[PDB]
Enzyme design. Structure first.
Site, PDB file in Angstrom:
ATOM      1  N   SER A   1       9.947   2.167   2.674  1.00 16.08           N
ATOM      2  CA  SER A   1       9.388   1.533   1.472  1.00 16.08           C
ATOM      3  C   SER A   1      10.444   1.414   0.366  1.00 16.08           C
ATOM      4  O   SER A   1      11.457   0.753   0.562  1.00 16.08           O
ATOM      5  CB  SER A   1       8.173   2.309   0.986  1.00 16.08           C
ATOM      6  OG  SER A   1       7.372   1.499   0.144  1.00 16.08           O
TER       7      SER A   1
ATOM      8  N   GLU B   1       0.778  -3.343   8.087  1.00 16.34           N
ATOM      9  CA  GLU B   1       1.344  -2.873   6.820  1.00 16.34           C
ATOM     10  C   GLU B   1       0.325  -2.846   5.674  1.00 16.34           C
ATOM     11  O   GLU B   1       0.128  -1.812   5.036  1.00 16.34           O
ATOM     12  CB  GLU B   1       2.538  -3.749   6.415  1.00 16.34           C
ATOM     13  CG  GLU B   1       3.809  -3.585   7.260  1.00 16.34           C
ATOM     14  CD  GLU B   1       4.611  -2.348   6.876  1.00 16.34           C
ATOM     15  OE1 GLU B   1       4.177  -1.602   5.977  1.00 16.34           O
ATOM     16  OE2 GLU B   1       5.688  -2.125   7.459  1.00 16.34           O
TER      17      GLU B   1
ATOM     18  N   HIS C   1       1.170   1.013   6.558  1.00 13.37           N
ATOM     19  CA  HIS C   1       2.384   1.374   5.863  1.00 13.37           C
ATOM     20  C   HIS C   1       2.395   2.911   5.662  1.00 13.37           C
ATOM     21  O   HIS C   1       1.397   3.462   5.209  1.00 13.37           O
ATOM     22  CB  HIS C   1       2.435   0.602   4.542  1.00 13.37           C
ATOM     23  CG  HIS C   1       3.690   0.808   3.767  1.00 13.37           C
ATOM     24  ND1 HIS C   1       4.916   0.356   4.205  1.00 13.37           N
ATOM     25  CD2 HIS C   1       3.914   1.423   2.582  1.00 13.37           C
ATOM     26  CE1 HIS C   1       5.841   0.686   3.321  1.00 13.37           C
ATOM     27  NE2 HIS C   1       5.260   1.337   2.330  1.00 13.37           N
TER      28      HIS C   1
END
Length: 566
Positions: free
Chosen positions: A214, A347, A467
């Site tokens: 990230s 995600e 994610h």
């Protein structure tokens, strides 16, 4: 976050401390650094392995008082032996579990781990940069435990860096020496330390890999883009992010004033007077109020964080981002090292929590104009060309007559992750020596082993690979447990840490000594590829065409009449 996860997390915090005392040994050791001697301790894992642990190694002066918002300076060396048997504090930030502010301005440390201080050969060095939107995160082992990686013969290093306004304030006026990207400058100096000191821990200074997830991925990319870090490391891994993601930079030069005013500043909008107020404000007041800085227009245009990486307004000695990231890719030394990138299979599933508080967000897909790339869209998002671009997005993700939460979360995967990766690969191709880039797709779903980010996205009992679901198979955290060695989860740890270490070593992620990889032909992406191939990682490993590819090309068609901005 709920009153139940608060008491629950409180208990795991008390459990993690007893387990951490329990898993400690009496075997202290001393190592050399260019700043002096550091004392580590050996520690245990729930899998009965063991590793040497050096925590709280400073790589910069504490950035307090007059150094607040400034670039970092080198730390003061010491005689004697510095104690590194305990973690230091994290960067001042909002605790996502409680909501309280925690941490300290004294946060610029790194941690070094390895199963063997005196290897018979120099080892690959892996540097992890945590994510957290540049506003949260840490190198504490209750969140990023080295327990899985130390089964391998590598040296693993977890760095911290300044977060939020303390990390990324930016002022236009050149006299005040606050160009911005302080937090990124922290990472640079940490990389410099790792280059000059990893050898003292059995690491190979000529084989260093930086990776992150990230915001950590964007960080890693920035470290690959800036001139400041040229030839510091030799491999890069970009996990769910890079620097041209729309959330990975912002022009925030005007937002210092706003922050000042939220904190009780009285006076005019000039930088000097803004700076003087912010310099004497309590750190935890500035951080607590960051949430309120963004205007409603900015939130409308999908600006995610008030403060973050930025094009610096002027160049000084430690400047990291002198041009927009797209421009930096064109000369970036990092284009010429081996590179791995990837994403998870769902995600956007991370945004379940956000939707639960704002179901009105789903109606944004009625025209999707809010998700049109900002450089192409108009101020009010009302231009006929923008409605057109919005329609192309809409065709890509709305499956029926009315948008759903799933369409929305599917869009987010692309807005925030797949479309930016695509743009980066194509840009890199026009500016590179021809060093390979490898893709992966993390598609392994499990609820039997989880990590704290799942508490925040409210991912409890939610199918699909969101994610951050991959972190669980890289690092130990205080919500993990010993898994049977034959379990699908244990195998995934082995595979994931196996591939990452293999890539770190050779710049090539394929190994036949990794179980499941016997039929795998992992080829890098070529410029002449219309279709991306990725290693898809689930219960089995399988090379496939990236399933997101059609939707990716859809987003790209928004740039039909504006090919220069792609």
């Amino acid at each position: 976050v709920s009153l139940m996860e608060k008491l629950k997390w409180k208990i795991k915090c008390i459990e993690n401390k007893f387990l951490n005392y329990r898993l400690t040994t009496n075997e202290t050791v001393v190592a050399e650094t260019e700043y002096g001697k550091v004392k580590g301790v050996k520690r245990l894992t729930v899998y009965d392995d063991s590793y040497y642990s050096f925590e709280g190694i400073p790589y910069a002066q504490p950035p307090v008082g007059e150094l607040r918002f400034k670039a970092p300076q080198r730390p003061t060396p010491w005689d004697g032996v510095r104690d590194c048997c305990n973690h230091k504090d994290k960067s001042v930030q909002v605790d996502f579990i409680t909501g309280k502010v925690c941490g300290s301005e004294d946060c610029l440390y790194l941690s070094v781990y390895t199963n063997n201080l005196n290897p018979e050969t120099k080892r690959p060095v892996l540097v992890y940069i945590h994510g957290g939107g540049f506003i949260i995160g840490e190198n504490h082992r209750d969140m990023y435990g080295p327990d899985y990686f130390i089964k391998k013969d590598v040296v693993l290093i977890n760095i911290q860096y300044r977060l939020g306004a303390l990390g990324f304030l930016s002022l236009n006026s050149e006299d005040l020496n606050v160009p911005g990207n302080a937090g990124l400058k922290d990472q640079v100096m940490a990389l410099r330390w790792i280059k000059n000191n990893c050898a003292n821990f059995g690491g190979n200074p000529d084989n260093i890999t930086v990776f992150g997830e990230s915001a950590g991925a964007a960080s890693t990319h920035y470290m690959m883009l800036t001139e400041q870090t040229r030839g510091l490391f030799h491999r890069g891994i970009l996990m769910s992010g890079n620097a041209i993601c729309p959330w990975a930079n912002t022009q925030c030069q005007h937002r210092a004033f706003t922050l000042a005013k939220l904190a009780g500043y009285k006076g005019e909008d000039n930088d000097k007077d803004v700076l003087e107020f912010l310099m004497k404000a309590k750190p935890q007041d500035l951080i607590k109020l960051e949430e309120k800085v963004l205007t409603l227009e900015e939130r409308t245009n999908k600006v995610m964080f008030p403060f973050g990486p930025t094009v610096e307004p002027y160049q000084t000695a430690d400047c990291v981002l002198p041009k927009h990231p797209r421009e930096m890719v064109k000369t970036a030394w990092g284009n010429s090292i081996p590179t791995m990138m990837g994403n998870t299979s769902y995600e956007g599933l991370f945004f379940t929590s956000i939707l639960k508080q704002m179901p009105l967000l789903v109606k944004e897909l009625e025209t999707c104009v809010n998700f049109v790339p900002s450089e192409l869209a108009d101020a009010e998002r009302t231009a006929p060309e923008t409605l057109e671009m919005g329609a192309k997005i809409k065709k890509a993700h709305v499956t029926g007559e009315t948008p759903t939460a799933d369409n929305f979360m599917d869009l987010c995967s692309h807005f925030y992750f797949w479309f930016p990766m695509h743009r980066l690969l194509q840009l890199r191709f026009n500016h590179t020596s021809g060093t390979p880039v490898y893709l992966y797709r993390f598609d392994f779903d499990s609820e039997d082993l989880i990590n704290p980010y799942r508490i925040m996205r409210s991912g409890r009992g939610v199918k699909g690979v969101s994610h951050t679901d991959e972190l669980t198979y890289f690092f130990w955290n205080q919500l993990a447990k010993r898994m049977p060695k034959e379990s699908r989860e244990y195998k995934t740890i082995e595979r994931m840490t196996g591939i990452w270490t293999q890539f770190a070593t050779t710049g090539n992620p394929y190994s036949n000594e990794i179980e499941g990889m016997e039929n795998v032909s992992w080829d890098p992406i070529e410029k002449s590829d219309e279709v991306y191939k990725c290693l898809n990682i689930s219960d089995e490993l399988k090379m496939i065409d990236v399933p997101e590819m059609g939707k990716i090309k859809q987003w790209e068609s928004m740039f039909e009449k504006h090919r220069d901005l792609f």
